[PDB]
Design a protein around this ligand. Structure first.
Ligand SMILES: [Zn+2]
Ligand SMILES: [Zn+2]
Length: 76
């Protein structure tokens, strides 16, 4: 099997993995994965360098983000 983890790249705030320069995507001043760059609420293709973030996980401007950040959450 492959020996060593020669990468020389920043980790991923999604899977805490060594983002490869080949699939390296700069966004919000960080390095994510072409597969990790997917909303968790709407689960729709996002764009690197034009989205919101909360707790490390990305989220569309709204209502995605909006909801997460609001009073009187879903209940009853
Ligand atoms: Zn990742
Ligand atoms: Zn979304």
């Amino acid at each position: 099997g492959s020996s060593g983890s020669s990468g020389m790249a920043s980790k991923c705030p999604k899977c805490d993995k060594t983002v490869y320069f080949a699939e390296k995507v700069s966004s919000l001043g960080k390095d994510w994965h072409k597969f990790c760059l997917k909303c968790e609420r709407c689960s729709k293709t996002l764009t690197p360098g034009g989205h919101a973030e909360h707790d490390g996980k990305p989220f569309c401007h709204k209502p995605c983000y909006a909801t997460l950040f609001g009073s009187g959450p879903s209940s009853g």
